[PDB]
Write a protein that holds these residues in place. Structure first.
Motif, PDB file in Angstrom:
ATOM      1  N   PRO A 120       0.799  -1.237   0.000  1.00 56.61           N
ATOM      2  CA  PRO A 120       0.000   0.000   0.000  1.00 56.61           C
ATOM      3  C   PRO A 120       0.825   1.276   0.000  1.00 56.61           C
ATOM      4  CG  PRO A 120      -0.838  -1.575   1.605  1.00 56.61           C
ATOM      5  CD  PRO A 120       0.480  -2.103   1.146  1.00 56.61           C
TER       6      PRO A 120
ATOM      7  N   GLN B  33       5.724  -5.364   8.758  1.00 59.61           N
ATOM      8  CA  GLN B  33       5.433  -4.237   7.882  1.00 59.61           C
ATOM      9  C   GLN B  33       5.976  -2.937   8.470  1.00 59.61           C
ATOM     10  OE1 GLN B  33       1.282  -4.235   6.945  1.00 59.61           O
ATOM     11  NE2 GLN B  33       1.477  -2.857   5.183  1.00 59.61           N
ATOM     12  N   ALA B  34       5.724  -2.711   9.763  1.00 62.02           N
ATOM     13  CA  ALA B  34       6.267  -1.537  10.438  1.00 62.02           C
ATOM     14  C   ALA B  34       7.787  -1.588  10.503  1.00 62.02           C
ATOM     15  CB  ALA B  34       5.675  -1.421  11.842  1.00 62.02           C
TER      16      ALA B  34
ATOM     17  N   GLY C  17       1.602  -6.968  10.637  1.00 58.74           N
ATOM     18  CA  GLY C  17       1.823  -5.587  11.037  1.00 58.74           C
ATOM     19  C   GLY C  17       3.219  -5.340  11.575  1.00 58.74           C
TER      20      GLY C  17
ATOM     21  N   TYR D 233       9.057  -0.509   7.123  1.00 57.08           N
ATOM     22  CA  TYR D 233       8.912   0.934   6.952  1.00 57.08           C
ATOM     23  C   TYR D 233       9.972   1.699   7.738  1.00 57.08           C
ATOM     24  CZ  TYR D 233       4.356  -0.374   5.031  1.00 57.08           C
ATOM     25  OH  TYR D 233       3.345  -0.936   4.287  1.00 57.08           O
TER      26      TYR D 233
END
Ligand SMILES: [Mg+2]
Ligand SMILES: [Mg+2]
Ligand SMILES: [Mg+2]
Ligand SMILES: [Mg+2]
Ligand SMILES: [Mg+2]
Ligand SMILES: [Mg+2]
Ligand SMILES: [Mg+2]
Ligand SMILES: [Mg+2]
Ligand SMILES: [Mg+2]
Ligand SMILES: [Mg+2]
Ligand SMILES: [Mg+2]
Ligand SMILES: [Mg+2]
Ligand SMILES: [Mg+2]
Ligand SMILES: [Mg+2]
Ligand SMILES: [Mg+2]
Ligand SMILES: [Mg+2]
Ligand SMILES: [Mg+2]
Ligand SMILES: [Mg+2]
Ligand SMILES: [Mg+2]
Ligand SMILES: [Mg+2]
Ligand SMILES: [Mg+2]
Ligand SMILES: [Mg+2]
Ligand SMILES: [Mg+2]
Ligand SMILES: [Mg+2]
Ligand SMILES: [Mg+2]
Ligand SMILES: [Mg+2]
Ligand SMILES: [Mg+2]
Ligand SMILES: [Mg+2]
Ligand SMILES: [Mg+2]
Ligand SMILES: [Mg+2]
Ligand SMILES: [Mg+2]
Ligand SMILES: [Mg+2]
Ligand SMILES: [Mg+2]
Ligand SMILES: [Mg+2]
Ligand SMILES: [Mg+2]
Ligand SMILES: [Mg+2]
Ligand SMILES: [Mg+2]
Ligand SMILES: [Mg+2]
Ligand SMILES: [Mg+2]
Ligand SMILES: [Mg+2]
Ligand SMILES: [Mg+2]
Ligand SMILES: [Mg+2]
Ligand SMILES: [Mg+2]
Ligand SMILES: [Mg+2]
Ligand SMILES: [Mg+2]
Ligand SMILES: [Mg+2]
Ligand SMILES: [Mg+2]
Ligand SMILES: [Mg+2]
Ligand SMILES: [Mg+2]
Ligand SMILES: [Mg+2]
Ligand SMILES: [Mg+2]
Ligand SMILES: [Mg+2]
Ligand SMILES: [Mg+2]
Ligand SMILES: [Mg+2]
Ligand SMILES: [Mg+2]
Ligand SMILES: [Mg+2]
Ligand SMILES: [Mg+2]
Ligand SMILES: [Mg+2]
Ligand SMILES: [Mg+2]
Ligand SMILES: [Mg+2]
Ligand SMILES: [Mg+2]
Ligand SMILES: [Mg+2]
Ligand SMILES: [Mg+2]
Ligand SMILES: [Mg+2]
Ligand SMILES: [Mg+2]
Ligand SMILES: [Mg+2]
Ligand SMILES: [Mg+2]
Ligand SMILES: [Mg+2]
Ligand SMILES: [Mg+2]
Ligand SMILES: [Mg+2]
Ligand SMILES: [Mg+2]
Ligand SMILES: [Mg+2]
Ligand SMILES: [Mg+2]
Ligand SMILES: [Mg+2]
Ligand SMILES: [Mg+2]
Ligand SMILES: [Mg+2]
Ligand SMILES: [Mg+2]
Ligand SMILES: [Mg+2]
Ligand SMILES: [Mg+2]
Ligand SMILES: [Mg+2]
Ligand SMILES: [Mg+2]
Ligand SMILES: [Zn+2]
Lengths: 60, 97, 204, 101, 149, 127
Positions: E16, E40-41, E37, E44
């Motif tokens: 995304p 993913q974090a 999550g 990032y």
RNA sequence: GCGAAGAACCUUACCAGGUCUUGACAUCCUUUGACCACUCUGGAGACAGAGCUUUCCCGGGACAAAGUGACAGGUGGUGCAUGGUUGUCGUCAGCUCGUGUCGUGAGAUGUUGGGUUAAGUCCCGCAACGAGCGCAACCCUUGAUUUUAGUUGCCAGCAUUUAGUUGGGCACUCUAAAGUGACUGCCGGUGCAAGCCGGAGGAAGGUGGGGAUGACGUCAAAUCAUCAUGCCCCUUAUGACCUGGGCUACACACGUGCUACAAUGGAUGGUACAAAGGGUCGCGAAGCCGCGAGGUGGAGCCAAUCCCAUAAAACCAUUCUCAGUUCGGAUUGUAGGCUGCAACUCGCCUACAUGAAGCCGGAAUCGCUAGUAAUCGUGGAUCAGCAUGCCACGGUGAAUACGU
């Protein structure tokens, strides 16, 4: 020893926690369901005959 | 303002009984609210299939209860008499509040 | 490999329960009263060719229906056997019992009756092949679409047990809308115990 | 016209197709034929043997490599190509036409 | 012996934030116990560290590193004459990227910093400069294939 | 003046309602950043409004229950996609091109007896 | 982690000691017909000894005490004498028949061959043409949707309240009956065809996902201990009653599991989002007390209404900073809580203290092809109390399949 076992189970126990449950067709002590008072084997055969109302073989 | 709860193990005879009660109430009374289907409740019984051994071979049985609810709003003597005088089938259980 | 009880596979699908009553908080005692009623009726009307017993309950009132081949033995000359049965059932249940009698037309198309017949011939020392074949013949000429029988045990008093089965027509067991009747009865022989199994596939 | 929801289209159509392809113009065969015509007894040994079992006389063109003793009115010729077979068949057919009237 | 033929292939979705499927595949490869999550974090934050230190967008740095740690030759076992021997073989594109990501995560988990974002960022930066644990893993794989050619 | 949609995903079901406005998203009488504090979930939720070029012309007010947060988001996305489909027929290809009209059919399977899960089997030993 | 869906006593079948003999459990016999229950004395208890005592009904009957048989009573043996029920290959794809032909004959063909399929599924060949039980379909559930029906369910536009609360309404979810819908049905290629690769539309595409369903046969496979049963054994005992113990033993070896070896983590604080179930001799709210397990209290409920019921992982802040440690929790000391007549052998839970092994595991070996594996909690049966087991429910959610 089976008739003595059944007769002793039917009698009132000396203490309240003395009491246990047996299948009402065959005096079997284990695996007794207490909505029907039936052990698993008698339950299965009577359910196949069609003599336990409401219950049917579960497909889901 | 009259509540009727019907419960059975199959929906065909219970459907017939509910529709018949609604018909009689409409005939002898003034009003009725259609039969609301309450959720059916099912219970499952898992049993060992063998007599001695074989834990991993089993069998499920089930038992379902089907329910309906009916209300008559305009109660009259004829409606109450006709509703109480009905002869519902055996296997269908009626509860009037 | 094992097979599922053909009646048990069709209860609720295309068939109906033999105990048509609903109950809560009084289910086990009703069930065992029904079991006692069934056993006592089966032990009294033994030689009356009784095919089916169904029991219903409504507000301290037990209704019993006995589908039987020959009602003349069940329903007596004017109500002797029926009233004896009803009084005995009243004393057995302590309720109000009403007994209804119906007659089975085409009694050769019911599996329990033919299984009883084969067991009776086998107890009377009639060769198993003859009894099985003749029962199949009568059942097929009665209008069935399929018959299958087997007899298993110490066949003919041998030392080693085996099973023999015969059939005529078709009996589709895997089809759910097929209406197979099924029955199993024991023959009490001086050599042991024999088992008779009958499948009858009718038109439906 | 419709008796099955979809099993008609699924099965019946190919059923008639294959059945008529195998059968041909014998859909109204009333009884056994009084005679048979055979293009060659080698490639059609099953048919000629079956006819022989029924004691039905047969007429058939054959090649130099066929069996003439099995046919009681054997007519060897060139059964290959198209013109010769068509000519012989047309002769036999308009011959039966001029007599069946 | 059975297998009835080639099978369909999975269809992953573009991330995304960084609209690429390879970021999603890296996130999936770092996943543990179905915790999308967390990984993913972590990714990032690692790309934040990359953009902070190097000063350019993390996507081209990541692509340079992956191009620098994708293999070409690999050793496979062949059983002949009752004995098994290593032999050279060439990877497809799918296996090329699969091995690249596998080695990246495997040798990023084995570094020696406090957190995981720092470890991933440092491994990526090393791979972008032809250095690190993941870089040598494809160096010997090239070597092992040649010695058995 | 209201365009309605119903979305479902796993055991989650969402009533999405769409009204002309500024872009204010409301979820269960709670703000859409307070209800969803992550960012990729917001991206997946607003995919239907980005596929077509109508992102900021609408307000969506949703009413979700069942399942978990990712199921919440998937149901919301399906509902808003169907509401946009109701707004104008010409949106039908685009929403179909990204697969935003498909209701996802895969739901959690059934535990089987003799197994520890739907497919997981006990540890096997010859001896 | 098999019978056992609950071994402290009972269960209990085993052992020690104490007792009984038509009997703990059934029919008939002979006298009496309501016996049992209760109080006190002795005993570990079974049992004995005294009083109040037993109210059958309409010769019938079922109950009831005494004495006596005829008899009862065996979880005693043989599963290799059996019935019934089950496992296994294996949901593997087989097992046959009718009418014809080929064989002196038993027999053969169909059912062999080439393709295709999940499949004896189908096609093309071929002296065979068809059919039946098995495959597939009919049954259940899940994914889309229409009508009928709006309470205890829902709340949109409206007034109201701590609050969908109250008024009001079935609009929307939902509930549950009856239907619709998917068939390689249409398009392109390929093939003689079955079929195979792609494309459209559609909620869904190639038997969409998953159940129930286990043919003919194999292993003298398992079970005389669920039940029933031939034959063979015991009958002042291999039957019957009781209290205590044992099935929980411990140098060791194997099977199946749970908890960890930490930073994708530990502690503290804040704070969201489920499904499926159970509840009347039952579930048990608010409030108050306790550090806590819990106590007290009694509301609402025979339940789409009330209760169990806090979901936990996830997310947000502060801290720890790679340390056998603020990891890990075994083991042991003290003080308590519940259930129960009773917790020593031998219950589960709590508080404070103690703080073992363990740094990701050798040769080797197991499960799994998608909402699957992995991981996080929840409920239920058995059940006074007791599960890391079994059976179900949802939350988050992958990697890979070149190939034989
Ligand atoms: Mg016995
Ligand atoms: Mg107990
Ligand atoms: Mg059980
Ligand atoms: Mg069983
Ligand atoms: Mg097994
Ligand atoms: Mg099965
Ligand atoms: Mg089987
Ligand atoms: Mg059976
Ligand atoms: Mg059977
Ligand atoms: Mg047998
Ligand atoms: Mg794949
Ligand atoms: Mg996600
Ligand atoms: Mg709202
Ligand atoms: Mg809300
Ligand atoms: Mg809102
Ligand atoms: Mg609010
Ligand atoms: Mg839901
Ligand atoms: Mg199952
Ligand atoms: Mg298991
Ligand atoms: Mg195992
Ligand atoms: Mg092993
Ligand atoms: Mg196991
Ligand atoms: Mg044990
Ligand atoms: Mg004892
Ligand atoms: Mg005896
Ligand atoms: Mg013997
Ligand atoms: Mg034995
Ligand atoms: Mg046997
Ligand atoms: Mg055996
Ligand atoms: Mg043996
Ligand atoms: Mg056997
Ligand atoms: Mg033996
Ligand atoms: Mg086999
Ligand atoms: Mg075979
Ligand atoms: Mg064969
Ligand atoms: Mg052959
Ligand atoms: Mg077939
Ligand atoms: Mg089938
Ligand atoms: Mg629904
Ligand atoms: Mg397509
Ligand atoms: Mg599914
Ligand atoms: Mg299906
Ligand atoms: Mg043996
Ligand atoms: Mg074996
Ligand atoms: Mg063995
Ligand atoms: Mg044995
Ligand atoms: Mg015995
Ligand atoms: Mg026995
Ligand atoms: Mg046993
Ligand atoms: Mg035994
Ligand atoms: Mg037992
Ligand atoms: Mg386990
Ligand atoms: Mg684990
Ligand atoms: Mg700690
Ligand atoms: Mg916290
Ligand atoms: Mg919640
Ligand atoms: Mg709930
Ligand atoms: Mg409970
Ligand atoms: Mg609970
Ligand atoms: Mg809960
Ligand atoms: Mg240490
Ligand atoms: Mg301890
Ligand atoms: Mg203790
Ligand atoms: Mg204890
Ligand atoms: Mg402590
Ligand atoms: Mg110490
Ligand atoms: Mg150490
Ligand atoms: Mg360490
Ligand atoms: Mg393996
Ligand atoms: Mg598979
Ligand atoms: Mg787990
Ligand atoms: Mg855990
Ligand atoms: Mg848990
Ligand atoms: Mg768990
Ligand atoms: Mg739990
Ligand atoms: Mg539990
Ligand atoms: Mg419990
Ligand atoms: Mg557990
Ligand atoms: Mg525990
Ligand atoms: Mg577990
Ligand atoms: Mg494979
Ligand atoms: Zn029993």
């Amino acid at each position: 020893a089976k008739k003595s076992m059944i007769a002793k189970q039917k009698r009132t126990p000396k203490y309240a926690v003395q009491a246990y449950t047996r299948c009402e067709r065959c005096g079997r002590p284990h695996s007794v369901i207490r909505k029907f008072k039936l052990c698993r084997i008698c339950f299965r055969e009577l359910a196949y005959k069609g003599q336990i109302p409401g219950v049917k073989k579960a497909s889901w | 303002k009259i509540r009727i709860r019907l419960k059975a193990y199959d929906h065909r005879i219970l459907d017939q009984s509910a529709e018949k009660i609604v018909e009689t109430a409409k005939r002898s009374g003034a009003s009725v609210s259609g039969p609301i289907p309450l959720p059916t409740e099912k219970s499952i019984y898992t049993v060992l299939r063998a007599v001695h051994k074989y834990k991993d071979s089993r069998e499920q049985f089930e038992m379902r209860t089907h329910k309906r609810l009916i209300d008559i709003v305009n109660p009259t003597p004829q409606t109450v008499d006709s509703l109480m005088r009905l002869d519902l089938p055996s296997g269908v259980d009626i509860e009037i509040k | 490999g094992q097979k599922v009880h053909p009646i048990g596979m069709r209860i609720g699908v295309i068939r109906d329960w033999d105990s048509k009553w609903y109950a809560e908080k009084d289910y086990a005692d009703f069930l065992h009263e029904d079991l006692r009623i069934r056993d006592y009726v089966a032990k009294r009307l033994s030689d009356a060719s009784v095919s089916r017993v169904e029991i219903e309950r409504a507000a301290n009132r037990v209704n019993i229906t006995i589908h039987t081949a020959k009602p003349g033995m069940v329903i007596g000359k004017g109500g002797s056997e029926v009233e004896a049965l009803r009084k005995n059932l009243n004393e057995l249940t302590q309720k109000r019992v009403h007994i209804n009698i119906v007659e089975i037309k085409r009694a050769d198309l019911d599996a329990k009756l033919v299984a009883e017949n084969i067991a009776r011939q086998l107890e009377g020392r009639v060769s198993f092949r003859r009894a099985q074949k003749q029962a199949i013949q009568r059942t097929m000429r009665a209008g069935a679409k399929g018959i299958k029988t087997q007899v298993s045990g110490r066949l003919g008093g041998a030392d080693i047990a085996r099973a023999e089965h015969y059939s005529e027509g078709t009996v589709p067991l895997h089809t759910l809308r097929a209406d197979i009747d099924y029955a199993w009865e024991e023959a009490d022989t001086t050599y042991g115990k024999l088992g008779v199994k009958v499948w009858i596939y009718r038109g439906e | 016209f419709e008796v099955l929801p979809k099993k008609e289209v699924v099965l019946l159509k190919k059923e008639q197709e294959k059945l008529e392809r195998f059968l041909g113009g014998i859909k109204d065969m009333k009884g056994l034929p009084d005679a048979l015509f055979i293009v060659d007894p080698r490639k059609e040994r099953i048919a000629v043997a079956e006819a022989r079992k029924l004691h039905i006389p047969i007429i058939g063109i054959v090649d130099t490599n066929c069996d003439p003793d099995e046919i009681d009115y054997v007519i060897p010729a060139n059964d290959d190509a198209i013109r010769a077979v068509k000519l012989l068949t047309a002769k036999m057919a308009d011959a039966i036409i001029e007599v069946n009237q | 012996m059975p297998r009835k033929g080639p099978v369909a292939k999975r269809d992953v979705l573009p991330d995304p934030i960084y609209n690429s499927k390879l970021v999603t595949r890296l996130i999936n490869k770092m996943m543990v116990d179905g915790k999308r999550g967390k990984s993913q974090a972590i990714l990032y934050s690692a790309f934040d560290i990359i953009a902070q230190e190097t000063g350019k967008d993390p996507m081209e740095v990541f692509e340079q590193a992956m191009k620098n740690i994708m293999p070409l030759l690999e050793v496979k076992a062949r059983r002949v004459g009752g004995a098994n021997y290593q032999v050279p073989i060439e990877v497809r594109a799918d296996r090329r990227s699969t091995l690249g990501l596998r080695w990246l995560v495997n040798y990023a988990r084995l570094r020696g910093e406090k957190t995981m974002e720092v470890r991933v960022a440092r491994e990526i930066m090393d791979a972008a400069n032809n250095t690190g644990a993941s870089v040598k893993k494809r160096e010997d794989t090239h070597k092992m294939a040649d010695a058995n050619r | 003046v209201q365009y309605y949609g119903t979305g479902r995903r796993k055991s989650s079901v969402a009533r999405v309602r769409l009204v002309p406005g500024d872009g204010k998203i409301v979820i269960n009488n709670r703000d859409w950043e307070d209800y969803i504090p992550f960012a990729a979930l917001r991206e997946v939720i607003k995919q239907p409004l980005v596929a077509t070029e109508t992102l900021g012309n609408y307000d969506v007010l949703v009413n979700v229950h069942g399942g978990g947060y990712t199921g919440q988001a998937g149901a919301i996305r399906h509902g808003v996609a169907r509401a946009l489909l109701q707004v104008a027929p010409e949106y039908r290809p685009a929403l179909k091109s990204a697969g935003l009209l498909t209701r996802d059919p895969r739901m959690k399977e059934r535990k089987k007896y003799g197994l520890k899960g739907a497919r997981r089997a006990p540890q096997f030993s010859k001896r």
